[PDB]
């Protein structure tokens, strides 16, 4: 919330012309219209094959093998225009034009004069046009060029080519999934794909109120907090401004302090009482109190600028452990307000391959983190940096965030120009989100003498937010010493493949390739089920990543099943056995362990993936077996020597007793039964429970202040029988099929 | 080989323009043929001294004194002239201008219009004049102005200020030589001195071509070679064109691989068998094989480009060393297809003053390396960048190429104009010449925190060629301990001085300044003499380097000969013997010692210097001396405690049998006779030699695999007779007189 003089909303319909791009790229508005091209009504915020699909131009990309068809777009150019009525600019004021999205490449144009151009898809544009704009009508015309043909204006270096991100996302500042990855289509796509706004400021304006908790005492319920404002301040309107900073919660007044505005930029330290402390889930309340700054004049009371957010009082340190294993990634806790957290989330990844539909998925996809019980999640740096209301709701839920600065697998250039670029893009997104305390660590996510992470992004950091963390650097039987003897305290990006919801199949594929034995030969899949697993390029081949699902199958159950339900359930078991094994094995091996992001809780695309839950909200069993793996205080069982060792972890700041229950579901014999005491904070061990007779399964039953929780866990040595299984599950109570 | 649609010569007749520079440089057409010059037919490649020759405008620079009376030039301005027919161009081709030389700061017209400015004389220079190109005659103009003049554009720093280069070379990107060195002439000179072409590209065309050996396996005839090829390709073409790569040895292909060209740039690894990996000379063959690549469409057939050269299949690391001195100069030895190699090899200085004569003496030059079987040659950094064909040279016989970045003695400029021109000229040398097989290192010859060798050199290497090495840093008595006690393991840069042949001497000086004793007075040199030594500016003075001559053969034969004939013998017996010791020093002192790299080979003005061979070919004593103590195998004496060692030291990979015969000269008496066995790539001791009584000479004649080989030792203590010493070389049989 930034109450400027007036903020005129252009989203809406606009006109879009496309192209082919010419040898010479268009760049002017007469070249534009004097282009052979289509024009067709187009939707902003949106992308152009959006636009297209509503003339009936292209087919739905979410279809079978439609997304290669959007391939020869890949090198059109998209010409926007449309017109709006001039907002009231008085004398002094300035007239900004904001674009919270332009992809990518385009010349910005009111009334047929240029007011920018622009090179970066993740950040904002905003243009003063207050000397251009003009009484009545106005014109707004934005013409994009083809991103793809702007890498061909480089020259890469060795160790830009050949990596899994495209050699195309190299030289350009654009999310490097949209070129294709392994869990997301290739759509590079175009368009303005968030909001266009018209907004209006006096010369007393808020240019910048930077946030910063200095000190946090919970227990006594005080705060110090740091208000960095940086103004607009003309000289006659020096000591004739003051600042009313306003903190408050529930409509509730905390603290109000006014100041004399003497100069641009001021630092306000405020020494609060009873105010609480914003905690990830588990470890406490994700407090959230109402921080407001206005400039008011003195004598008049006119109120020049207002800047409204919702603030966390919050510490965080990254404690890098340096005696075991310092050299190796991973050996890192999170410590929040003094407290030692242990991390439990998932990876984030695009919630869609057009990007312009992101803002709509926001509140069911962090509903599904909330339900998932997450305490973190990692932004991926293969996607686009979230909005303003991702955050917030990250805020409100207690979702501690890891953001990766936006780049992908590869070596990138160590040259004047793509630094420049990339430090304009790194201050504008922390100055963006470093007031939200849901934020906990920047991520260079990359040899260790590269001038990208080990320069420009660490000394953004360095001056414009020093209270954060900068780390400059980041499959067959679940049961391998790959996963059993990994030496990682923090372990991430931990994934495992899963079938999707039939309902999900029969959506995506076409009647014809539902199945995906073609011709009947089980193993081999037919060119849609290849192409939604995902191929980037139209290739003929077989075999890929599609062939892990049925390795995987064959592991844990001796067979692939043929009945296409059988299949799913097969898969879906298999996912769902295995997440829940990674997580009970590192929350059992506390203290030494400090978290684990798994990989990953939402499709961003209707695609066979390591997914639990797919692009539709269809979750698959993994999702429950790790609902119930992810609680506060949950009992879990893991290997032993000679046995299996009943534990119960502890993410909280609070104590707790209880009963747990552990019994054969076959047999119905009681294995154990006792009281157990969960200490804060820690892992707690209850019992060494002896060893079982051949293949089976226990049920664990533990209740905590009054509430039944359930877990369960699968002893002997694979295969085992579908069916079997699939009535241990049903016998179970736990979860469905 | 690049086939470009089409190649057009425009080297050849020129009108040269040429007049004194006023105090406003001349940089317009307008001005230049306004300036009030003379007019002179010059040659396209050529220097302007040359063209001022024929014209019968200057006297011979290399006789005589009359280096000095080109100073004057060195304040003119050259304005090259000339028309050429437009080739055809047709659509979407496009018409690039080419220079391989522009000595050095000029301003290019084409049609009166400026295509480019130029700055560097050490690269190439392409402008793409397809918009100014006309139907029928074309003007070419290129005004260039005083290289001189240009460092006064600049401010220097303490420490570049009273270094032995030149302070007119150290703001300006220029060979550091052409100012003056004690081994080079000073004649800054000017002009095109490399070729100038017109070329026509397609739009789709072949940027980069970067060949890279991935591993070697010498036995198996395995190696995996990496293509990092980066293309035009507009946007139709893509999915339309195919890159044909094809690997062959003596019209024999050994692999083609065709693949779809979907993105710009690629990486194509290409798994090899039945191939032999490229050696150093010694330790095996050099084998090259022919890589083509051609971007040929899939529907016509159509070949829009094709890249052709000469690759080798080759590992190279530098293995430092530590536990002895600390990160000193020689502590490193080269490791080639994981085998330690041994270096032996001349520094490369230029070939020519007049450096567009460079090309026509690359062959005579490299053969002198040939017959004197170098296995690396150090290309000095006070020189030019060699062309393609020089390393296409060391490619072809096997010569290992050390490549110092043109740097001169001195600290250099510390801030960002001359850092982004180094960059620049680093970035364009490294792609040129990152593809030869022989290239082996880069060095940056520079005290540790130097921006230019710690920083802009180095992260050049890191981004463009991350697959070789990059070294930031580089007597009276031959047995003065001075070398015989040197810690150096790979000693480098080592030389001593010896007089030229007698035709030589006739042919430099005038028929009166043949005889170096001015008016007789044996020791005092004419001022002939003292110009050839090199003496850079006309300062009248007696003494410098000439008394390095006289008082070595003072040391070796007490007194120095008044005869030239026997002065020529004695000066070149010294170096001989000087120079043969070094070199069996360090062969004899193996593993420690790494490698020697000794000065130098040849001279490239006619000039009395270290070099074994003048600039006219004539080898000293000294070249033969070298070429029996370089053999692949070689028997040798080194001194001993109690005696002399005869050792026998093996550069290759295999083992060889023989036996070796030492006997007195004088005597007759065999001192040693017996077999021997060399080992592999290391040096065997044969036997410890008894002393011998006073002076005298020992002949050492030993036979592998039934080839005849010689050598010999002096011993006794100096100083000795000269007509003793060369009736033991004439004796000897082995070398003449």
């Not at 187009?42 to 959006?50: S, T």
């Not at 000190?215 to 607009?232: C, D, G, I, M």
């Not at 390795?551 to 898969?571: K, W």
């Not at 119960?648 to 579901?665: A, C, I, P, R, S």
Request: aromatic share 12%; charged share 20%.
């Amino acid at each position: 919330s930034h109450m400027f003089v007036s903020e005129q909303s252009l989203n809406g319909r606009w006109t879009l012309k496309f192209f082919p791009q010419p040898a010479v790229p268009v760049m002017t508005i007469e070249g534009a219209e004097a282009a052979n091209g289509i024009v067709v009504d187009a939707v902003v915020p949106g992308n152009v094959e959006i636009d297209m699909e509503a003339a009936g131009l292209v087919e739905d990309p979410m279809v079978g093998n439609n997304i290669y068809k959007l391939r020869p777009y890949e090198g059109y150019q998209w010409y926007y225009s449309r017109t709006f009525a001039a907002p009231v600019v008085t004398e002094g004021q300035r007239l900004v034009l904001h674009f919270g999205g332009i992809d990518t490449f385009a010349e910005v144009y009111v009334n047929g004069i240029k007011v920018g151009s622009a090179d970066n898809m993740l950040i904002e544009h905003d243009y003063d046009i207050t000397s251009v704009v003009k009484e009545g009508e106005n014109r707004l015309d934005v013409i994009i060029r083809s991103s793809v043909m702007e890498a061909q204006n480089h020259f890469l270096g060795t160790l830009s080519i050949g990596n899994f991100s495209n050699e195309e996302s190299a030289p350009v500042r654009r999310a490097p999934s949209t070129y294709g990855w392994d869990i997301m289509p290739r759509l590079v796509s175009a368009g303005l794909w968030r909001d266009v706004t018209l907004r209006v400021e006096n010369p007393v304006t808020i240019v910048d109120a930077n946030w910063v908790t200095l000190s946090v005492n919970p227990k006594a319920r005080e705060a110090s907090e740091s208000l960095y404002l940086q103004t607009r301040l003309p000289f006659e309107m020096h000591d004739k401004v003051k600042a009313v900073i306003t903190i408050s919660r529930d409509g509730r007044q905390i603290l109000r302090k006014e100041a004399l505005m003497r100069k641009f930029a001021n630092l306000f330290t405020l020494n609060l009482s009873g105010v609480d402390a914003w905690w990830p889930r588990g470890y406490g309340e994700p407090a959230l109190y109402t921080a407001e700054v206005s400039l008011v004049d003195v004598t008049s009371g006119k109120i020049y600028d207002t800047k409204t957010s919702k603030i966390g009082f919050r510490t965080v340190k990254l404690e890098l452990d340096e005696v075991n294993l310092p050299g190796q990634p991973g050996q890192f806790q999170f410590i929040i307000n003094g407290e030692p957290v242990f991390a439990k989330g998932t990876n984030w990844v695009p919630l869609d391959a057009l990007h312009s539909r992101d803002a709509s998925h926001v509140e069911e996809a962090v509903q599904l983190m909330v339900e998932m019980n997450c305490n973190i999640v990692r932004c991926w740096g293969g996607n686009v940096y979230e909005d303003t209301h991702f955050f917030e709701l990250c805020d409100k839920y207690g979702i501690m965030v890891w953001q990766d600065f936006a780049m992908g697998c590869g070596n990138y250039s160590q040259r004047d120009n793509f630094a420049a670029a990339l430090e304009k893009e790194a201050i504008s997104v922390v100055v963006k989100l470093r007031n939200h305390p849901s934020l906990i660590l920047w991520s260079g996510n990359n040899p260790n003498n590269d001038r990208v992470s080990r320069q420009v992004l660490s000394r953004v950091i360095y001056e414009f937010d020093p209270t954060r963390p900068y780390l400059p650097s980041s499959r067959g039987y679940y049961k391998d010493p790959f996963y059993t003897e990994n030496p990682s305290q923090f372990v991430s990006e931990i994934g495992y493949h899963g079938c999707p919801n039939r309902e999900t199949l029969e959506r995506m594929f076409s009647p014809d390739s539902v199945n995906p034995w073609q011709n009947g030969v089980v193993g081999m899949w037919n060119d849609e089920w290849q192409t939604k697993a995902n191929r980037i390029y139209d290739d003929k081949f077989q075999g890929g990543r599609n062939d892990l699902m049925t390795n995987q199958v064959r592991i844990i159950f001796g067979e692939v099943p043929a009945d296409l339900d059988d299949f799913i359930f097969a898969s879906q078991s298999v996912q769902a056995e295995a997440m829940k094994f990674f997580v009970e094995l590192w929350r059992g091996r506390r203290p030494y362990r400090t978290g684990i992001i798994w990989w990953n809780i939402r499709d961003g695309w209707p695609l066979l993936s390591d997914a639990i839950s797919d692009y539709w909200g269809g979750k698959k069993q993994a999702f429950y077996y790790m609902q119930n793996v992810h609680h506060d205080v949950c009992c879990l069982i893991n290997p032993a020597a000679n046995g299996y060792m009943l534990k119960v972890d502890n993410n909280t700041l609070k104590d707790f007793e209880g009963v747990v229950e552990v019994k054969d579901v076959a047999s119905g014999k009681q294995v154990f039964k006792g009281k157990f005491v969960s200490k804060a904070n820690q892992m707690s061990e209850i019992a060494t429970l002896p060893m079982q007779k051949g293949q089976g399964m226990l049920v664990i039953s533990y209740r905590i202040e009054g509430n039944e929780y359930f877990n369960h866990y699968l002893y002997g040595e694979p295969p085992y029988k579908l069916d079997q299984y699939r009535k241990w599950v049903k016998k179970c109570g736990i979860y469905e099929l």
